[PDB]
């Protein structure tokens, strides 16, 4: 039973993990007005955070594979909670301290997205492990929704972003204490050389990279796209999208778990096929989103709802594939390398590239509001291509999943 309590506490930890990510991005307009900084600094905040995460991911992965995956995780929790609360103090004249604090949160936050999945895989190993991983990666929609919900609520309560950056750290420190208490006590060069020869894991990592590309581009451009659609058609969109994303992620993880359970009764390849059967499907509805931008009066872009439901589904099935195809001593490094390759090719390169494409299309022709909306749509047409490539790489994972699962099980046996 204490494994269920440990899984619940790690789920809450992940909730605070993601709520501490989008808190500095749901109130970014107020921070931009406060420090006198411009769009360059607004991008720089999350850019330095992501680069810090990608620097500190392999190191914490290797450390977790080495020694005491629990104290590292609790120390990371305590670190970024204490760092965010301290960053709340930061005056107006000092912006590079805020940038440095986001960098330190990035360092200290690679010890939860790359270490907690290993503990979850070590607690349960069955369909209940799939259920607990569904909870842990449903904490991702919940974090990404409550981030904007809290960012709006705090400015509805007081005229500060300081409360947005102060409300979470106390609960994060409480979660650190409970992680340290209620979680039971469960070469690198050669390991990494042996993680690229794993074809199932390689193609699953590519699929996750494509998923992250899609999520990043859509999340940082769709609100402005719908705003331009309203402008040509003739604030609250933040909370609307946050609530939509939260409920849709609930629905998506439920759909993914149900489809995996109903499809595992037919073939051994029900983990890497079903995601593709969703992902391609998601891509299809993504295209309809743009059509929904033309005449949102009848159907108010519910294709966002459907595509997000079919896309926020594979987060836990990717973790299941990883736990199947990677032996328990290499799991922390496998997750760390997967996250490094994901965020290198994903949500750190999606919004900037989409903006560059939009700039090229807008500069190609004389500017007009209808042309702005059309240029953004033509630039976001690239997202379905990446989702389709993610589906194709999930099928490529399906080709070798059974072989790699058998090999991993054999090596685990001895």
């Amino acid at each position: 039973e204490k494994r269920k309590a440990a899984a619940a506490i790690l789920s809450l930890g992940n909730v605070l993990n993601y709520l501490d990510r989008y808190t500095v991005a749901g109130v970014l307009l107020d921070i931009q007005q406060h420090f006198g900084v411009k769009d360059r600094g607004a991008g720089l905040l999350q850019s330095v955070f992501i680069c810090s995460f990608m620097v500190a991911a392999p190191i914490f992965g290797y450390l977790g594979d080495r020694f005491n995956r629990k104290v590292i995780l609790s120390c990371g929790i305590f670190f970024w909670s204490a760092v965010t609360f301290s960053s709340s103090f930061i005056p107006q004249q000092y912006f590079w301290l805020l940038v440095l604090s986001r960098g330190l949160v990035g360092i200290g936050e690679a010890s939860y997205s790359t270490i907690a999945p290993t503990i979850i895989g070590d607690l349960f190993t069955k369909n209940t492990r799939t259920l607990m991983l569904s909870v842990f990666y449903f904490a991702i929609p919940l974090g990404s929704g409550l981030g904007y919900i809290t960012g709006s609520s705090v400015k509805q309560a007081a005229g500060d972003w300081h409360w947005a950056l102060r409300v979470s750290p106390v609960l994060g420190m409480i979660t650190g204490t409970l992680i340290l208490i209620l979680v039971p006590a469960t070469s690198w060069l050669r390991d990494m050389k042996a993680l690229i020869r794993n074809r199932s894991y390689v193609f699953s990592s590519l699929a996750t990279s494509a998923v992250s590309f899609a999520t990043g581009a859509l999340g940082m451009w769709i609100p402005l796209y719908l705003h331009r659609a309203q402008v040509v058609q003739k604030a609250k969109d933040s909370l609307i999208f946050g609530a939509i994303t939260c409920f849709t992620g609930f629905l998506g993880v439920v759909t993914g778990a149900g489809a995996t359970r109903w499809c595992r009764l037919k073939t051994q390849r029900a983990d890497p096929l079903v995601c593709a059967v969703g992902m391609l499907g998601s891509a299809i509805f993504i295209c309809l989103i743009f059509v929904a931008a033309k005449s949102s009066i009848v159907g108010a872009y519910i294709c966002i709802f459907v595509g997000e439901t079919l896309l926020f589904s594979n987060w836990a099935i990717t973790a299941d594939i990883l736990m199947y195809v990677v032996i328990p001593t290499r799991r922390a490094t496998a997750v760390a390398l997967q996250s490094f390759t994901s965020h290198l090719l994903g949500d750190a390169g999606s919004p900037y590239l989409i903006g560059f494409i939009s700039d090229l299309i807008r500069q190609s022709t004389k500017d007009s509001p209808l042309w702005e909306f059309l240029s953004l749509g033509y630039a976001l047409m690239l997202c379905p291509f990446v989702v389709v490539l993610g589906g194709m790489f999930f099928l490529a994972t399906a080709l070798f999943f059974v072989s790699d699962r058998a090999r991993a099980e054999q090596q685990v046996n001895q």
Side-chain angles (χ1 to χ4, degrees), residues 152-210:
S152 297
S153 189
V154 299
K155 60 197 291 212
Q156 286 295 107
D160 270 3
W161 49 274
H162 302 265
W163 292 124
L165 286 185
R166 267 165 169 113
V167 59
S168 74
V170 57
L171 178 57
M173 280 205 257
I174 285 175
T175 300
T177 299
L178 288 182
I179 284 170
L180 190 150
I181 284 175
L182 271 173
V183 171
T186 51
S187 69
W188 177 42
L189 184 61
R190 282 308 83 91
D191 271 346
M192 182 179 72
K193 196 197 65 179
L195 294 174
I196 294 90
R197 214 81 81 180
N198 216 350
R199 274 91 61 82
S200 169
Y201 168 66
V202 170
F203 294 130
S204 170
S205 170
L206 298 197
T208 290
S209 167

Side-chain angles (χ1 to χ4, degrees), residues 46-355:
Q46 203 79 354
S47 177
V48 75
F49 167 74
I50 285 299
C51 291
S52 173
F53 197 111
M54 271 145 58
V55 169
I59 298 173
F60 282 163
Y62 155 83
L63 266 294
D65 278 328
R66 286 312 164 273
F67 182 76
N68 206 3
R69 322 195 293 282
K70 172 181 73 169
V71 65
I72 290 178
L73 191 151
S74 186
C75 281
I77 291 282
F78 282 131
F79 189 67
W80 50 246
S81 302
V83 161
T84 286
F85 185 86
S86 294
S87 166
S88 200
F89 287 168
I90 281 175
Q92 189 194 355
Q93 286 78 18
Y94 289 19
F95 180 61
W96 56 274
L97 276 73
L98 173 61
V99 184
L100 205 77
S101 174
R102 292 328 292 192
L104 290 202
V105 167
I107 300 299
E109 195 166 358
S111 77
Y112 210 91
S113 181
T114 61
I115 300 291
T118 67
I119 295 171
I120 297 169
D122 279 3
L123 293 187
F124 284 106
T125 63
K126 60 186 287 185
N127 183 226
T128 63
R129 184 202 48 188
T130 286
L131 165 65
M132 301 325 188
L133 280 156
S134 68
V135 171
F136 179 89
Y137 293 94
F138 158 66
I140 290 190
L142 180 60
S144 279
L146 304 196
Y148 295 99
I149 295 317
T150 315
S152 297
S153 189
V154 299
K155 60 197 291 212
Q156 286 295 107
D160 270 3
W161 49 274
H162 302 265
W163 292 124
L165 286 185
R166 267 165 169 113
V167 59
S168 74
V170 57
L171 178 57
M173 280 205 257
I174 285 175
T175 300
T177 299
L178 288 182
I179 284 170
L180 190 150
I181 284 175
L182 271 173
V183 171
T186 51
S187 69
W188 177 42
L189 184 61
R190 282 308 83 91
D191 271 346
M192 182 179 72
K193 196 197 65 179
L195 294 174
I196 294 90
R197 214 81 81 180
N198 216 350
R199 274 91 61 82
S200 169
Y201 168 66
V202 170
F203 294 130
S204 170
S205 170
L206 298 197
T208 290
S209 167
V211 170
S212 67
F213 194 104
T215 66
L218 287 194
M220 280 135 287
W221 292 97
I222 288 296
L224 189 153
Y225 188 53
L226 305 180
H227 199 306
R228 290 185 176 172
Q230 290 161 12
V231 168
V232 64
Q233 183 154 260
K234 274 164 302 293
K236 285 148 54 172
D237 290 27
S238 79
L239 190 150
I240 280 180
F241 203 90
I244 283 298
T245 284
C246 201
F247 288 153
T248 298
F250 181 76
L251 201 61
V253 66
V254 162
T255 289
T260 300
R261 194 171 81 230
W262 169 254
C263 201
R264 266 193 215 175
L265 301 202
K266 316 305 198 317
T267 192
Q268 193 77 58
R269 272 161 264 267
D271 288 328
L273 292 174
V274 74
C275 302
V277 176
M279 287 263 302
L280 282 74
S282 66
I284 290 303
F285 270 92
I286 279 176
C287 277
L288 293 175
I289 289 160
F290 303 152
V291 171
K294 307 277 208 299
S295 298
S296 170
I297 53 172
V298 177
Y301 50 86
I302 47 181
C303 309
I304 285 292
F305 200 106
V306 171
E308 211 170 14
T309 301
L310 299 176
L311 196 70
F312 288 179
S313 68
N314 57 6
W315 295 103
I317 313 177
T318 306
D320 287 331
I321 299 159
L322 185 149
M323 311 275 157
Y324 280 132
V325 309
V326 185
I327 67 171
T329 311
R330 297 191 264 114
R331 262 166 194 160
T333 314
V335 186
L337 188 60
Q338 202 185 21
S339 277
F340 176 91
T341 304
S342 168
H343 297 188
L344 162 66
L345 311 171
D347 61 1
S350 68
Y352 307 86
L353 163 64
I354 293 289

